[PDB]
Each structure stands twice: as C-alpha cells, then as structure tokens.
Design a protein around this ligand. Sequence first.
Ligand SMILES: Nc1ncnc2c1ncn2[C@@H]1O[C@H](COP(=O)(O)OP(=O)(O)OP(=O)(O)O)[C@@H](O)[C@H]1O
Ligand SMILES: Nc1ncnc2c1ncn2[C@@H]1O[C@H](COP(=O)(O)OP(=O)(O)OP(=O)(O)O)[C@@H](O)[C@H]1O
Ligand SMILES: Nc1ncnc2c1ncn2[C@@H]1O[C@H](COP(=O)(O)OP(=O)(O)OP(=O)(O)O)[C@@H](O)[C@H]1O
Ligand SMILES: Nc1ncnc2c1ncn2[C@@H]1O[C@H](COP(=O)(O)OP(=O)(O)OP(=O)(O)O)[C@@H](O)[C@H]1O
Ligand SMILES: Nc1ncnc2c1ncn2[C@@H]1O[C@H](COP(=O)(O)OP(=O)(O)OP(=O)(O)O)[C@@H](O)[C@H]1O
Lengths: 362, 362, 362, 362, 362
Amino acid sequence: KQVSWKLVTEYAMETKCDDVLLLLGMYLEFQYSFEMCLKCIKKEQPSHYKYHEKHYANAAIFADSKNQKTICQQAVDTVLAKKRVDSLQLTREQMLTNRFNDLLDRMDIMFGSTGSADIEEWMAGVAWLHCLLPKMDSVVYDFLKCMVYNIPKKRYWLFKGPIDSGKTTLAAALLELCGGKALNVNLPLDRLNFELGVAIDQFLVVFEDVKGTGGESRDLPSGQGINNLDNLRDYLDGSVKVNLEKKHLNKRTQIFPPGIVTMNEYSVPKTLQARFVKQIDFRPKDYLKHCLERSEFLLEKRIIQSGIALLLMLIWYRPVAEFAQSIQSRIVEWKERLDKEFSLSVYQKMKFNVAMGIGVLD
Amino acid sequence: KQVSWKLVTEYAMETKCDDVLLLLGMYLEFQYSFEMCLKCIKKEQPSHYKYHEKHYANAAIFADSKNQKTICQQAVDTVLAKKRVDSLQLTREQMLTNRFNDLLDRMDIMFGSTGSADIEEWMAGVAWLHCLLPKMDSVVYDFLKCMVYNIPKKRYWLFKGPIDSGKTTLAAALLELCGGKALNVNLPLDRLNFELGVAIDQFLVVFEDVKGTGGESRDLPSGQGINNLDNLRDYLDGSVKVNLEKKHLNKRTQIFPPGIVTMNEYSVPKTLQARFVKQIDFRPKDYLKHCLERSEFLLEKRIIQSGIALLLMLIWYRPVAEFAQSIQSRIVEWKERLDKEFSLSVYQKMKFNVAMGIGVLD
Amino acid sequence: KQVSWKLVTEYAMETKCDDVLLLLGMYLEFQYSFEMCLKCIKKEQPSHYKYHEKHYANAAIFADSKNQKTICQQAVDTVLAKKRVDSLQLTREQMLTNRFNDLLDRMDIMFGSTGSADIEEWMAGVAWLHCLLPKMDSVVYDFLKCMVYNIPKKRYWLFKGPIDSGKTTLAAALLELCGGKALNVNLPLDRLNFELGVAIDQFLVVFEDVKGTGGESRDLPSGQGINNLDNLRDYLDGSVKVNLEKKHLNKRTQIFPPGIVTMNEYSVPKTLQARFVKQIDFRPKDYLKHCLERSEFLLEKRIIQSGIALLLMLIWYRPVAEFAQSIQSRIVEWKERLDKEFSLSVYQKMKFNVAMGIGVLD
Amino acid sequence: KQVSWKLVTEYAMETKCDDVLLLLGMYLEFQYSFEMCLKCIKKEQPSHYKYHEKHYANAAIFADSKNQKTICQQAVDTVLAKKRVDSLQLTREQMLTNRFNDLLDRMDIMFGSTGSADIEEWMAGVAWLHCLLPKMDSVVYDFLKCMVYNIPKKRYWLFKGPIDSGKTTLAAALLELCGGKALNVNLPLDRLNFELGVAIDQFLVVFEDVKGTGGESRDLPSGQGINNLDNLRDYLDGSVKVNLEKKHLNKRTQIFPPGIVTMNEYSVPKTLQARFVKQIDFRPKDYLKHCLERSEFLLEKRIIQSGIALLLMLIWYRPVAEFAQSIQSRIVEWKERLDKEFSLSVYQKMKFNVAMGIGVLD
Amino acid sequence: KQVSWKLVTEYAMETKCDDVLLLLGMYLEFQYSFEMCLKCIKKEQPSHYKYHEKHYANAAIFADSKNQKTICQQAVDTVLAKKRVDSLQLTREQMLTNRFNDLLDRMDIMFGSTGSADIEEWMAGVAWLHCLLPKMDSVVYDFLKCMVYNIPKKRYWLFKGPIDSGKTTLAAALLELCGGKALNVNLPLDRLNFELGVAIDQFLVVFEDVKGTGGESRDLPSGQGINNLDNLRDYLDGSVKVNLEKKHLNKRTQIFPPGIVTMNEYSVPKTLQARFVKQIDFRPKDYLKHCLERSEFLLEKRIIQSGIALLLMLIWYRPVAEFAQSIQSRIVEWKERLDKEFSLSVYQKMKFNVAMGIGVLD
DNA sequence: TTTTTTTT
Ligand SMILES: Nc1ncnc2c1ncn2[C@@H]1O[C@H](COP(=O)(O)OP(=O)(O)OP(=O)(O)O)[C@@H](O)[C@H]1O
Ligand SMILES: Nc1ncnc2c1ncn2[C@@H]1O[C@H](COP(=O)(O)OP(=O)(O)OP(=O)(O)O)[C@@H](O)[C@H]1O
Ligand SMILES: Nc1ncnc2c1ncn2[C@@H]1O[C@H](COP(=O)(O)OP(=O)(O)OP(=O)(O)O)[C@@H](O)[C@H]1O
Ligand SMILES: Nc1ncnc2c1ncn2[C@@H]1O[C@H](COP(=O)(O)OP(=O)(O)OP(=O)(O)O)[C@@H](O)[C@H]1O
Ligand SMILES: Nc1ncnc2c1ncn2[C@@H]1O[C@H](COP(=O)(O)OP(=O)(O)OP(=O)(O)O)[C@@H](O)[C@H]1O
C-alpha cells in the first residue's frame, strides 16, 4: 500500500513548515506508536502531539519509502507557493491581521492552562517598555500604520542614540511583531547581492547599526555601511520594482519592503536623510539599568525584546476599533482577561516601581 | 484517470501567469468545490473566480499527482515561448497596442461595478501630473513615439535634477505604462551580467539615480555607475543583437531595449553625454508639495505613480486619431465616459486648487 | 530479494554518522563474515564490532546493489534531519545534558577494561588546571551557566594576558566540553563570509588570537581582527537572527552562538568592550612551567587540552545537585568511582607537587 | 501514433533556429488547422507560412506530448552542431561570403518596407565619402582582399591625420561594414595584457589612437601607446600563433587577426612605420565640412559613419565579377534597384553639391 | 548477460585507482583477446598484465554497456570510501606500516627478474646518502618516530645551510618515504589561504625555502616567509585543531600535520626557534660534488632523490625489532637478499670511495 | 550550471 503525498502536504501546510529537513525530521517521529509517544504524553510540542495520531498510519509507510526527500520537496513547494499567492493578492492589512491571529494563538498557549509563562512577568515587561519612550503606544500605532500604508519615499524610521540606548531592543520587538528580517550592510559590495536576496517576499527589513565614516573623531570605528546604503536609494524609495538574488535561482522582481534603521551617531548625507520620514532619539537612563539589575528575569526570558510584549501593550492601551474588524472579538476577549488579571492600580504600582528604579515587583 | 497538462497550460496562457510557483499555488486552489468557493462567491480575484468552475475537475486530479512542479514547468514555458515568438514577430506598434488593450481591460474593471477607484480622485492625479510640467501629455506622446521608433543612438532620454523633483515619479508612471524594467548599476562591473539578463524581451528600460563622481562637492558621494555606463555604451547604442544571459539557461541574442535615465546632478562624461536624444530638467515646486500635504490620498493610492493615470491623461488630452488605429473604438468609448463624467469647470477647479496648493477636491 | 534501506538508516542513526563516504565505507566492511571478522575478533573498534553481526546479511545484498550512493544519501539525510529538529526543539540546558551524556560514554570506555587510559594521569591534569586560576571550578560553573542562559549582549568572555599563559589551552578544554568550533577573524574581509559560515547550528564559538593594531609598541604583530570584530557587533549581541552562508548554499538565518575571545594585550574599542561580560586576566607563572617540564605525559597525551579533563574536575568539585536531573544517576556512580580510587591526601599531594614545581606524580 | 522527432529537427535546420524557446514557441503555433490559418492567409511570416501545412499533423501530436522541451533541446543541438562543424572548415572567403550575405539580408530591411531612411540619403553619404579621398570603392575592395588573404606582415594599414580628419568616422564605417572590434593601447602596460586578449577570435580589429609618447611636443596628447605598440611586434606580423588572455579564464593561443590602426600625427619610429603595409592620410577640407554643415541629416542618421553605406558603395561601383561567384546573384539586384532609383545624373548632382559644398540633396 | 559491477569494483580496489577516467580507460583495454595481448606479452605495466586474463570476460560485456561511466563512479566511490574509513580509524604507526608495504612491493618489481633497476646502483645510492650527514641512519630513525608520535610542540624540524647543500634533496626523499606535500609560504597573505588547503589529510608537510628578511645583509633575497610563519604558532605546535580550505570546497578541521622547514642562513626570531625539536646543519662538501661528477647515474636515474633509497638504508642498518611487527618478515627476507648480494666489505669500500670523492664504483 | 574563484 502506497504513501499518501496528500497527507504529507497537508501536514506541511497545517504546520507552515517550509524547510525540507524540518519537514522530513518532524514527519518521521510519527512512525512510532502514538499511543506510547512520550512527546505526546509530555505534551511537549504542539506541532507534534496534535498531529501524531492522525499521521501515524501514513508515517509508517513513509518510513519505508525510497523517495523520501522528493515527497518532502513537493510538500515544501506547496507551502512556498501559498506564500507567493498570498503576497500577490492580500492587502497589507490582511497580512498584518493574519500575523496578529498567529501571535494571539501563541498567547493562548503561553498563558493557557499549560500556563508555561506567567502573565505578571509578561505584563511587567510592558510597563518597562512604556517607560522607554514618551507616549510609547502612540509611537507603536503610528509605525504600524506607516508599514501598512507603505507610502512611497515615506517608508523608513531612523533610530539614533548612544550605545546601549535601547534602539536595537525596540527594533527587535517590532521585527517579531510584524515579521521580517535583519540584514547586515557593513559588508563587501559583491556578497551583499545575496544578502539582499534574503528580503524576498517579506514584510519588513531592519538594517542594524550600520557603520558610517569619520566618527572615529568620537571613536566610532568607521566602515562602509553608509556608503553601501547610499548605493540603494531606489530600494528605500519603493517607487519601482527591483530584482533580487538567490543562489542557483533566477531574479525575483518586486517592491523592496519598508523598515527601520539603527544608528550610533555617525553623520548622514542628505540623499539618505531625505528618505527617512522620522528620526527617533534614544537615551541611557541609569534607573532603567537599576530596574533591570533587579528584574533580570526580563532579560533571561527575553521579555522586553519580544513582539508579544508590544502586542500586549497595544491591547492594554488602544480602543478595540483601532484593530482590524475581524480580530476585534479576540481583542475584546483578551482585554477582558487583562482587565480581570490586573487592576489599573497594580499597573500603576509597576510603573512607579520602574520610575523608582527598584525592581518592578514589590 | 490522468491529469490533462493541456488544460493546465490553457489556464497559464489565459492568465498569462509566467511563474511556476505562482501558477502552482493558484491552480491548487481550484481543487475544492467551486460551488461553495468563498472566493468565487465573494468575487475576490478574477484570476480565480472566472476559472474555478471550469478547471475544478482537472484540479482535483492534479491535487493527487506526484509530478506537480514538472507539469507547471511545461505550462510556464509555453507562456514564455509565446512572449518570445510574439516579441520577434510583432511590430513595436502592435506590441504597444497590446499593452494598451491590457491596461484598458484593467480600467474597465477598476471603474466598473466594483468601481473601487474614484475616477475623480484618479483625474485629480492627472491634473497633478499635467500640472507638473507644461504640455505634459505632449512630451509623453513624444516619448512614446521615440520608443516605438527605437532609433539607434537616438534611443535614450535623460532626467536630471535634485532630490524630490519628481523624476522618479514620472519614470514610474511611464514604466507602468510601457511595460519595461528598472535596473540598478551602482554595482561592481563584473557582476552586472545577470542584472542585464532581466532586459531579455522587454519593450523599455529605466536606470534609477545612477552614481556618478565629483558630486561630493555637493554631498553626492561618488560611485561606479557612471563608469559602468561608459563601458556599457555598446548596449546604449543598441546597434547589434547582444547575447543576454540567465542562470541555468542558454543565453539569448537580441537588440538591447531603449530606455530612460534619472540623475541627481553628478558629472557626465562626454562619451555618455554624447548618447542621448534629449535631456529634461526637474525642479522642486513647493505649491505642489502643499497640495499633496492635504490631498495625500493621491499618494496613498500611488495614483501619481501609476501608468493608468497617464492613459487617462492621453485619453483626455489627445485626438482619437492620434492613437493607433485598432484601439480607437475603445478610445472613443472611454472618451465618452470621461466626457460624460466631467465638466471642464470641475477639471479646471481642481487644476486651480492644484496650482494654489489647496486640497484639490475643494 | 532486496536491500533493507531501513537497516541502513538504523545504522546511520545508531552511529550518528553524517558523512556519506564514512557511512558507505563502514557499511561495506560488514559484507565479510562477522564470524571470521578479525576486527570483531580483535574487538578493535566499537562502531564496527557492535554491529557487524546484526547488519551482515543486508550488507551482503548491499554489496551487490547498483544504487549504493543513493541509499547512503537518504540515510545521511535522516541523521542530518534529526539534528535540525533538535536545534529547534531542545532547551539549551537539555542540549548540554546530551553533550555530557556522550562524553560520559567515552569516559566509560576510556577507563574501562579496554583500559586505554590511566585515571591517575587524567586526575593529575585536574590538579594542574585547578592550580591555573583562583576558584577554577567556580569559573567553569559560571561559564557553563552563561552559555545555557544566553542572555542578550551579556554573552561573551574576553581572555587576555601574555603569550604562553594557557589561554588557548583553557579555551580548547571548554570548547571540547561543549559543542563548538573555533574561528580565525584576522582574515581579509571578503573571505570572512565563508569563515563565519562554520558557526551554523553549533553551540559555542571561540575566536582565536584576535590581532589588534597599535600593539607594535608592545612588540605585538598587528592585524585587523579587532576591527573586523567591531563590524560583527550584532553577532556578539545575539539579540536578533543573523544570516549565515556556506559555499553553494542559500543563507541560513539564526541566532549567532555565544563564546570566548582570546587575545594578547592590544586595546579594544568601547563598542566591543561593552559587549563582554567578563574579562579573565591570565598570568605566566614559573612553578606551572617547571612542574609541567617534569610532567610532560600531560601534554604528550593532550590531557590538559581536553574536555574530559574539565568534566572530571566538575565531578570532583561540584555538588550532585548542580547537574541536570537525569544525569545525576550517572554522576553519582562516577563520584563513587573517583573516591574509591583517590583519597584527598593523594589529590592534595598532587596539588602540592604542582605548587612546589615538582613533577606532579610521586 | 507519436511525435516524429525527425520532423522537428528538420524545421530547426531549415529555419536555422537555434533557441529552444523560439523553436518551441513557433512549432506550437502549427497545432491549429493550417487550412484556416490566418497567418498563412495573410502571408505574415515565411518562417510560418512556408511550413505549417507540412508540419501540422506532427504539431497536433506534439501539442499533447509531455516531453516537449526535450524534443526541442535535441533539435537545437543539431543546429548548433552544424555551426560547430562548419566553423572548422571556413576559408576566410567563405567566412566573408556569409558576413556580407548576412548584411544583404539586413539590407532587405534597410530599403525594404521598413525603409527607415532614404536610399537617397544613403547614397548621399556614399557621395560625401567617395570624395574624401581617391577612388574609394577600389580602396575598399583592396582592403577587403587584404583581409581575406591575411598574408603575414602584409596585414595592417594606418590612418594618419590630425584632429577632425575623419579617421574615427571612417573607422566607424569600416568596423561597421566588416565586423571586428576596437581596442585601446594607452593603458599602463600593467593593465594591457587582458585588453589584448579582447581581440581573441575577432576577424578584424581597429586600434584606437595611440597617444604619442612625447606626442604633446606636437600639441597632441602624450601617452604610452607608441612604445606599447612597437613592443608588440609579433602580434602585428601574424608570423606565429600567440597567447591570449581572457579575464577570469585561462590562456588561449591563435594567429593574431589582421586589421587597422588610427593615429593622430605623432612621431612614428622607423621600426613602427616599417610594420605597415599602407598609410592612408587624412586632413580637414572645406567643401567636406561645409557640405556636412548643410547635409546634417546624414550625420543625424549617422549614415556617414555607416559601414552599410560602404556596402552600398561597393554594390554600386564594382564589377560583378569582383564578388564571390554565387553571392554575385544578389548584387545585380541591388544595382538594378539603385539604377532604377538613380541615374548617374542624380549621383552626379549629389556629388556636385558635395564638391560645391552645397547640401547634397539640393 | 549482465555486467558484474562487483568485478569492476574489485579491480578498482585492487589497483587503488580513484580517478574515474583512469579507471575507465584501463578497464576497456581488457576487452581485446588476452590470449594475444601485446601489452601482456611485453610485460609493460603490472596494473595491466596481472589482471587482463581475469577481467577479460566482464570487460567484453562492459564494452557493450550503455551505463559505462555510471559503473565507474560507484567503483571510484568505493576506493574513496576506503580512504576515509582508514583516515579516521588507523593509528599513525599503522599508516606508516601500510606506506612501507607499498614501497616494498615496488622494490620487488624494480629488482625482480623483470627488474629494470640495478640493485648495485641503488646500493651506491645508499652509500652517497649515508655520507651526507653524521649519524644518518640514526637520524632517520629519530625523524620517523617524531612523526609517528606527533607529540605537540615537539613536532617540527629545521634544515639550514648554503645553497646546493642537499637540504631539499633530503626533504624530497623523506616526503616520498612518508608521503605528504610541499608548501610555499613566501606570499602575500591573501593567497596563503588556499595554499594551506594542500595540507588537508596529508601525513607530512614541507615548508620549502622560507625567505627571511634582512638576509640581504649577506646577499640573501629578502621576503615575507618567516614573517608569515610566525603568525601560525598554533599550526606548528599542533596542540589544537585548525580550519582548512580548498577551492570549491567547504572547510575541514583537523590537527595540522608535522613536517620540515628549510632555509638558507636567514636570521630566526626566538619565537620561531622555540618551535623546533631539532635543527640540522648542511654543509657543501666538495668530495660529494666530485663524486656526483663521476657517478652521474645517481642523478640521472634520480636515485638519491628517492624514498626507496632511504628505505634501503633503513633495511640495511636498522635492527629487525625496530620495524612494525607485521612487516618484520618481509624485512628479514630483504635483509637476507641484501646480505646475500653484498658483503659488508664491498659496501664499506663504496663508502671509502665516496670519502675519496672518486667515483663510487670499481 | 552555478558557484566559487578571480580579481582588487
Ligand atoms: N534607555 C536605556 N537606559 C539604560 N539602559 C538601557 C537603555 N536601553 C537599553 N538599555 C540597556 O542596554 C542594553 C542594550 O540595548 P540596545 O541593544 O537596545 O541598545 P542600542 O542603543 O541599540 O545599542 P547598540 O548600538 O550597541 O546595539 C539593554 O539590554 C539594556 O541592558
Ligand atoms: N516637482 C516637485 N515639487 C515638489 N515636490 C515634489 C516634486 N516632485 C516630487 N515631489 C515630492 O518628492 C517625492 C519624491 O519624488 P521623486 O522620487 O520622483 O523625486 P526625485 O527627484 O526623483 O528624487 P530622488 O533623486 O531623491 O529619488 C514625491 O513623492 C513628492 O512628495
Ligand atoms: N600560566 C602559565 N604560566 C607559564 N607557562 C604556562 C602557563 N599556561 C601555559 N603555560 C605554558 O604555555 C604553553 C602554551 O600554552 P597555550 O598555547 O595555551 O598558551 P597561550 O598563551 O594561551 O597561547 P596563544 O596566545 O598563542 O593562544 C603550555 O603548553 C605551557 O607549557
Ligand atoms: N575630411 C574632413 N574634412 C573636414 N572636416 C572633417 C573631415 N573629416 C572629419 N571632419 C570633421 O572632424 C570631426 C570629427 O571627425 P572624426 O572623429 O571622424 O575625426 P578624427 O580625425 O578621427 O578625429 P580625432 O583624432 O579627434 O578623434 C567631424 O565631426 C567633422 O566635423
Ligand atoms: N653536501 C653536499 N656537498 C656538495 N654538493 C652537494 C651537497 N648536497 C647537494 N649537493 C649538490 O647540490 C645539488 C642540489 O642539491 P639540493 O637541491 O638538495 O640543494 P639545496 O641547497 O637543498 O637547494 P634549495 O635550497 O635551493 O632547494 C645536488 O644535485 C648536488 O649536485
């Protein structure tokens, strides 16, 4: 009796798996008796224990197959095709709406009955971020609109401030929220070709702390980052489709996605300054160090640098109407949970703790 | 029973889909019962909702196949082969009349019963564009003619001027009209070969804001595109059918397309200066800026970037007889629709507001 | 009758082999009779003698196969797929627990009846290592925790001091204790792309002997490793997923691992100094040298380089509670075995000899 | 029944089609009933209507094939192999035969229905050139035979003349007529090796003018090209095969092609002078330049830079017997055309205007 | 009837061939009638004449196969697989023992009844080599043990002395005896990367003729050799692994081999001096020069270059117990042959003749 | 074949 390639394809689709080796490895686990499957019994990974019983019979036949890599390749191609279809047909707002549903599904696990992390430590992170900048949640909402609208040559925000000002942290949290990638531009112009190939078919890019020049006056070690970017004015502008690499693969032509750039304070030529729409300034604050020095669980669990914390911040602060119409129900549900789990006075206490630079909890 | 590769290819031809993943993805959507297909019901995408009912049976059998990518390969190659054969056997006029028919087909939908575009917003775009330079439509006709005639060493026009002067904006609309390609050559000489590969079988090309030299006198940092163009002068002359390249494929002898260049004001070498039909200056004009600042929905919807605005402009400004012959029926049909929609007062009231710097729709 | 590919995949899994040639070459040995197999009878090599008699009949049929490399390719893929799955799903603690289990398995062999090693020689090395720094075992525990926790920015330790202060000796031991590989970044900037590719999916990294510049005053030969490092600033921070490259392969995206930097007494930019948690300051000492001269069986058997030596140190000094819970069973048996062999007086006698600069043994 | 691979290959040979996508594209068109075929009915392309009826039955079966691209690949190989075989049998006269037979077919466009500049203007260019210097038609036939005979040392002619002597304009027409390539030699020797390799396997070359070593003694730019050339002794002579050097590729070796040199009027060494077969000698003349200033459409059409004007000139002046035996059959036809087009008195009146300095077409 | 792939693989294993083309061509020769085979009858190559009779039948079927290169690939894979198994599993003593067996086999041919060599001339070779240094046979035995033990730090030997004082002669014979490859470090650092790639999987390396700097004080050409070496202190001391790279290959990681460094009288930094176990002085001795001048068959047959001569020297001088236990039987057999064919007095006479600087033989 | 190497 033969393998159902259809069952494999369905698993890959349902998992959103898009690496042939992950798919291969994952599917093989299901060859063993699901009844005794310790991973199921431990409820260890949902992408396993939800599926093992259903896929078990087909995995036993797959384990004998001579074709295995070919079956997995087709399944991965089906997932990749779905992404391309979506990218060409969804509005950007639907893309974000889908991305939000996925994060909310994780939150249903994180704070589920399994309760693998506690909502107090997570909510504590929100207060720390809210203190990081003035009017923080307003700044986040502006950024989301900007990325969704994707207005030509109004597409990039510049983060500037000293070392350890917090700019990388905020970028990292935003990048998780929207989904996207970081790219290193402090590199030679040749291999840079394939670096940009990474950006194919994605929502955001982040360029990290690109080195400028002449800042060694202030001991900013100089480098090609700024020179490199100014070759790519068109990529930022987003007025024209551009052609993107991959190894052993032909060009893809598409608009280069919007994003943000982080900078210790080298100088900027005005060709490039003209292309940022908004610069934000970041500053060291010792009481914030002191808070972290006590509340080190924030860093160990990477709470403050994670997009989940930004979503929780938005849920706490924004009217339900500001969310895309479909998810508004799930937002109401989480607003209710949060209002139930915390008084405002508790949140005010946490903010005061952060302000005092004591550990967030007392 | 067995997949009809014939029916697959027929859909590929009819959508003009020419990507193997895009084709693969979309055809798989047809495997479900079209009678409940929410996309059909909701009339979301014509590339789906027209074809689903027809292709359904074959798509179910396709969904079972083990050959899927290979089927899509042969289908795509038929689409590309049509393009190549058509590329040789048609006159540039016939090419352009095909392109215009395609855009007219979109417009028939965009202002159709779905009608999601306001004609008057779109016409406000036309006003802004014809306001950008005198006799805008007339210079557009001169450009179109020059590209149809495609005369050796009279095949390129230069746009030169400072940032935010609109040169990029105009190139976008022309390129969206003509169906060409952008290329970037601010790059290491040896690497450009596959970038030039994109020029295979294109009506037109555009080079964006190429890096020159000596402009750092004025904060324009130097780069190689200037020298690259000098070496590429062979293609710019377009005397002979150069053998263009693409990965894992045979190379392709053809005449290099004509095109446009945009420039912030670096030096020009005499040899490059020698090669143009024409130069055009571009000049920041604050009253337009003040208008857009109110009227920003124009730019949000990219109206002023989009060739559909130019086509509406030429329908408005130009004689029916100025168009190529066979389309002149559709020209009249659309001329009538504009004539039905507008008083000249409405247009003039708008163009007044544009000249002032008011919200165009006051 | 036909090859069982399943038996080959089992052998690959059981040996954890991931070279197609090594797998092939070993599997082919099983085709002769195990009953006369002199390697079995000499019981020379465990990856052979455990398995020959099981695999025998399938090896004989495999010897006749026309497909041999395809069979091995599928088997090696399964072992590679297993690693990929684990690299997503295991905790860093659980990885380290696995790594320990395998070293402990080699320790069971080395000190077995096969008796390739003298535990007294190996314990001598622990005395030399524990003498090299204050509170040596505490330093190892703090480092291991740091690598398990992987706290952003707080990820890297800097080793510096004169040449011949044992810094690379110590780095080697840690690197063998964990998983990982070394890297040399004094390179030209372009080849660096493939240098960093080595880090993919690994646990530790060690940057080896980074040349600074300006050290020529201290007679240090000079180079660009430090300036290269300050370009890789985000790789140290580990705050966001970077892109990594191998020859003929698409870029992987992942967090760059934590690790150690070794150098002589150059200076370091603030941007890079800010990225080290801890700076260990090694010193030349004569008694270590004069002891080691009279103790050269240490170097001749590579004892003080090797991870097995550090593991013996931890088993001696650290409480059973400090190990991950599942290995505490094996740890207790090894603790018993050690004390059954060595009195404290014997160990202190060894440390006394080292402190005296006498040959460790007496 | 089944696709005849035989018939597909016949068409590829008969059309000399040597691109797999074109072959695929065109052959697919035959699948419709030729009896109705509108392309046949309108005689639009011979490459179609010559063949459709014969190939139709095979094309119907071809359209159902699942191997289609593979059939076309084998067919294209056959055509490429034919070129490969013949490339090793070409006499230089047989080579020349084709290289003009090609241009006669191109000229079936030049004054076909395309007719894109006046056959009058084209002969007016011929008029203007024929009175630059003596007997120009004979001079072409002589230079032509020189390049076909390729007699060692007896292979190179020199254009000596000041700035604006026309030698560059002439050189344009020469390479245009004949093929070959232009080259520089004023590089530093350090560079020049690769530049010399560029000539590899061209039938002919031009050298762009040496900037005289000490040439500015004449008020003409100084440079290195003199000593560079006379150091390149043997390349000129073609006595023996020489090594040649492509960038990024290994050596090749070949008899160095014959050709042409341009010079402004520098201090040619006796040795360097002795290399040449024939100086030709050029200076400003007033009827010429003032006629240009009155015939400027010829420069705008660059006809006076045109080798096609030279081919036209030979077609006019020279005996039929001077052309190779069979290709002669075409030249009479263009003469017949040109004679029906023009009396002598026309070409006379044109020539008179040039001699008078009058605008040639007056 | 079928081809036996097994018989081909046996021949490949038997001949140790690992080039597919060399394997292919040789097997095809067996298809002609062994019963008349001229190559057999001339006894030209053992690799042919030993096997033709055996493989004749299979080669006849092989000659008709359509799969020929596919068969050879699997065969060559088997030989490469054998090498990689051996590469990991053998001891360094086992490796050398195998190497010795190979030379002993070649000697059995060279001096056989078919033997084209002269055992007396090769014995004259041993006399000249034994004269080149003090204690020569004791010195060789010391060098070998050093390579077999591969003790870190204690790994490398330095040769120095004038030009034409024999150093590379000895290096070449040692390199032939052990196997290994020579390296050139007198480079800029960029190419040095692929240079070291040669060392992968070698038993020995020789650093030929390292240029110091400042030897120009005494007319030695200055260069970057020594300066490049002292970067690589880890590579010599061999305590820890290094990364190694070849063109088009992913990096490997291993202990860098032991080896020899050679120079004229350049100055040596003490940093480098401490790297070496031993330094051997060579001095030009005129009686050797006059002996070669009268004993030219030594040079012309390359006798004194050959590792076979050093092997003969070991066989003649060393006690049987010094060889690896397995080969001691062959050593006894060769010692018997040599003691039979040469008296001690005769060998001593040759040694006396070399001391006289007269020709070796009388 | 591309890529990597070459090239700078
Ligand atoms: N505003 C702040 N005040 C004090 N400490 C801060 C602040 N922001 C960040 N930190 C500390 O700095 C560390 C690094 O933050 P982050 O990487 O976001 O800064 P950055 O300015 O982007 O730095 P860099 O340019 O070096 O990447 C944080 O983990 C936290 O410990
Ligand atoms: N003539 C103009 N006057 C004022 N604003 C202008 C003008 N043209 C363009 N703009 C503004 O400049 C923005 C960018 O226009 P565009 O990219 O076409 O200019 P550009 O001259 O090509 O610039 P750059 O050289 O920086 O790419 C537009 O979105 C619009 O907001
Ligand atoms: N603290 C010490 N005092 C004196 N000698 C030492 C000390 N530590 C190591 N040694 C000696 O130094 C030798 C080399 O050690 P190692 O290679 O680790 O030195 P290193 O200074 O860390 O080297 P590098 O800087 O080149 O990596 C050891 O084999 C030992 O002989
Ligand atoms: N025979 C001629 N008589 C007068 N003017 C001439 C003649 N030939 C060319 N010209 C003038 O010379 C100008 C440049 O022509 P061309 O480049 O062909 O000359 P050249 O001698 O090769 O020049 P250069 O050495 O400067 O490159 C033409 O545009 C024309 O004005
Ligand atoms: N000890 C010696 N006394 C005299 N002549 C010698 C001696 N050794 C070598 N020769 C002569 O020197 C020639 C070259 O020897 P060899 O190539 O080994 O020299 P080298 O000094 O090691 O060279 P290099 O350093 O250039 O590689 C030999 O062929 C022989 O003629």
